[PDB]
Structure formats: structure tokens, C-alpha cells
Amino acid sequence: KLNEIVVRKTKNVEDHVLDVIVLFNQGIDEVILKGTGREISKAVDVYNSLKDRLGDGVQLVNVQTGSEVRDRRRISYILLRLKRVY
Amino acid sequence: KLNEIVVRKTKNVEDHVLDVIVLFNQGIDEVILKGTGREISKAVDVYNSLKDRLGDGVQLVNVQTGSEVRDRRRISYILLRLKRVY
Amino acid sequence: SNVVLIGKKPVMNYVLAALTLLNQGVSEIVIKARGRAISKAVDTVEIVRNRFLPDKIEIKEIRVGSQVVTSQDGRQSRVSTIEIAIRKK
Amino acid sequence: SNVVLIGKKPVMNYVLAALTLLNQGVSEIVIKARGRAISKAVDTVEIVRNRFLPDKIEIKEIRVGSQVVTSQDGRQSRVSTIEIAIRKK
């Protein structure tokens, strides 16, 4: 979505952090980070880096883990919903 | 020269955080938080609260634990060295 | 001790460790990880709750953290952490 | 496991746990705590390196952190964390 960000193996943490900062600069208030498989840790790193940068200026509204299925294969995911905070 | 703030029983975490903001606003750009005994956790709580308030405006540049001997009792301490960034 | 710390072993090793604690009657267990192991921590919980104990597990808490690591020689790094507390429903 | 998790018990229990791992041939252990227990974690390490193994242990790294704790209701709290890795010398 315009507001869901799927974390990607070929982008580093700061690449994703900057994607989110640019959205915040455009007036976007909320984003959801999604990581699957080995990108789960990266989704968390991105949240933590955004929090290291913005502190109380950003908040983790919710965090959820779960599983989805693609070609009958179960895949793990994490969702981190982030909001500003003014 | 270098400013040390002892984290004491007689003031809560938020008030110690705000004391550090005052110092920063007066051009102190580095402080060492010290806690001893049960106030070790309190000192870490102050650091983390400051980190939440300032984000990338503050960095934990060093941490040290150790012991002092006062009145023949060995008492543990932590020192957290915080630097204001920008 | 009610903790399963995720390391570099195959995910099933941690699934089995979790199942073992649960089968021994431990009420709540905590799956913990740092850094890249965070993915396997989530995956371990997902395998337990879907493959082995469907309808039987709830996640009580997720703890998402970050720490500054300061080494004896002065090196510093920042590392993510996760802890996922699960229980029988 | 090379982890000593600090809980609610007296500090000497954790000192003993640490000494026991070290005496069993584990050359590096990690003392971990959250919240108020952080003081006891630091204290455990200090008792080990002053009273029991003076000049025979060093701190390899100190990890200072924070976690956001989300429960099933969706409400959150923040909790400080520490981990101290110590090793024989």
C-alpha cells in the first residue's frame, strides 16, 4: 500500500529509514512496516532506527506477528505500525 | 570541567531528565549520569528517558560499571556518558 | 530457564526446546533473540502455534528493544532485540 | 546456556550461579536483567570480580537498552535492559 512498506532484502536498514522519513516530510502520519522471513529482523531494525532518530516523535502503535500462506507454504511475518506524534 | 549528575533517591526519573535538559540548554553538551546501589537502575532509566525525549540529539558514548568503598562497604556504580549531538 | 534463546542452530532445534518446556508443564515461556536471530525467534513461535499446537497457544507479550553495545576496547554498536512471551490458552 | 538471568532472589544466588558456570569451564557468561533488576545485575558482576575472582575476570561488553512491551490488550510500557558479558582472563 501507499502506507504499508514491505521491507526488502536488497535495501539496507538506513535505505528504509529514509523512505519513511521522506513520507513523514510529505505529511504522511502513519506507516506499517512489514517483514517476512529473514526480513523480519530488518523490519525491527528499521523501527528501532526510526525510534533512535525521532525518539518520542514516533510511536509504535502496534506490533503483531503471524503467518501467511503462499503456494501452500507457511511464511512468518511481523507488522510494526508507526505513528507521529506532534 | 566534566559535569557528573548523581541520580538520587530524592528526585524521580522525569525530574532528573528535565535537570539534564536544563544543562543542555545552557551549553553543557556532555554529562555523566552516576547511580550507585539500587539507583543503578534509576540512572539507566534516566538515560533511556532522555534518549526518548531527544532521539538523535543525544548519544550514549560510554558506559562503565565498578565499585567504590565507602565506610568499609563495597558499593556498585554505573556511569553513563551522554553527549548532546547536532 | 523458561527462556529459549535463539542462536545459529536450525529453527527446529528451538521449536523442540519450546515444545519441551511447554510439555513439562511450564505455564509461560519466552523466546528471545538479538540481531538477525530475531527472524528465527518469530518463526519459532509461528511454527509452535501453527504446526504443533494449533488452537492452544497465545502470545501474551511482544517486547521490541534496542541496545547500545559498548566493548572493553571502546567499540560500540546498536543491536535490536525481541522477546515473545507465549502461554497455553 | 551461558546466561544468568537476574530475578527477584538475593544477589548471592546469582553470584553463585555465575561462579558455578565459570567453575564448570564456561569462560564467558552473560548476566542479563530488566527494570529494577539492572542494579542487581551490575552488583552480581561486581561481587564476582572483587570478592571471588579478583583479577581473574573482566567485562567484555556492557549492553544498555530499552524495550517497548506490548500486551494482548495493545497497551504498552517501556522497560530498561542491561546485559553484561564477562570472561576469564
Curated annotation (Swiss-Prot), chains A, B:
Pfam families linked to this entry: Alba
Subcellular location: Cytoplasm; Chromosome
Transmembrane segment boundaries: none
Location (main, coarse): cytoplasm
Keywords: Acetylation, Chromosome, Cytoplasm, DNA condensation, DNA-binding, RNA-binding, Zinc
GO BP of this protein: chromosome condensation
Residues carrying N6-acetyllysine: K9
Any one GO cellular component localisation term in the record: chromosome
Described purpose of this protein according to its UniProt entry: Binds single-stranded DNA, RNA and double-stranded DNA. Involved in DNA compaction.
Quaternary structure and interacting proteins, as annotated: Forms homodimers and homotetramers. Homodimer at pH below 6.0. Forms homotetramers and higher order homooligomers at near the growth temperature of 80 degrees Celsius and pH 7.0. Interacts with Alba 1; heterodimers lack cooperative DNA-binding behavior and result in more compact chromatin structures compared to Alba 1 homodimers.
Protein name: DNA/RNA-binding protein Alba 2
Native organism: Saccharolobus solfataricus (strain ATCC 35092 / DSM 1617 / JCM 11322 / P2)
Phylogenetic classification of the source organism: Archaea, Thermoproteota, Thermoprotei, Sulfolobales, Sulfolobaceae
Curated annotation (Swiss-Prot), chains C, D:
Residues modified as Deamidated glutamine: Q24
Effect of F52A: Decreases DNA binding affinity and cooperative side-by-side binding between homodimers
Modified residues (N6,N6,N6-trimethyllysine): K8
Keyword hit for Transcription regulation: no
Binding site for RNA: K8, K9, Y14, R34, R36
EC number(s) per entry: 3.1.-.-
Modified positions (Aspartate methyl ester) in chain numbering: D43, D73
Any Gene Ontology biological process: chromosome condensation
UniProt-annotated site: Not acetylated by pat acetylase, residues: K9
Annotated positions of the N6,N6-dimethyllysine modification: K8
Record-listed N6-methyllysine modification sites: K8, K32, K56, K89
Residues with the N5-methylglutamine modification: Q67
N6-acetyllysine found at: K8, K40, K56, K60
Annotated family: Belongs to the histone-like Alba family.
Subunit structure, as described in the record: Homodimer; homodimers assemble cooperatively on DNA with consecutive dimers binding end-to-end. May form higher order oligomers, e.g. homotetramers. Interacts with Alba 2; heterodimers lack cooperative DNA-binding behavior and result in more compact chromatin structures compared to Alba 1 homodimers.
NCBIfam families for this protein: DNA-binding protein Alba, PRK04015.1
Role played: Binds double-stranded DNA tightly but without sequence specificity. Involved in DNA compaction. Possesses DNA endonuclease activity. Prevents transcription after DNA binding. Binds single-stranded DNA and RNA in vitro. Binds rRNA and mRNA in vivo. May play a role in maintaining the structural and functional stability of RNA, and, perhaps, ribosomes. Binds double-stranded RNA (dsRNA) and exhibits RNA chaperone activity. Required for normal growth.
Name of the protein in question: DNA/RNA-binding protein Alba 1
Designated gene of the protein: albA1
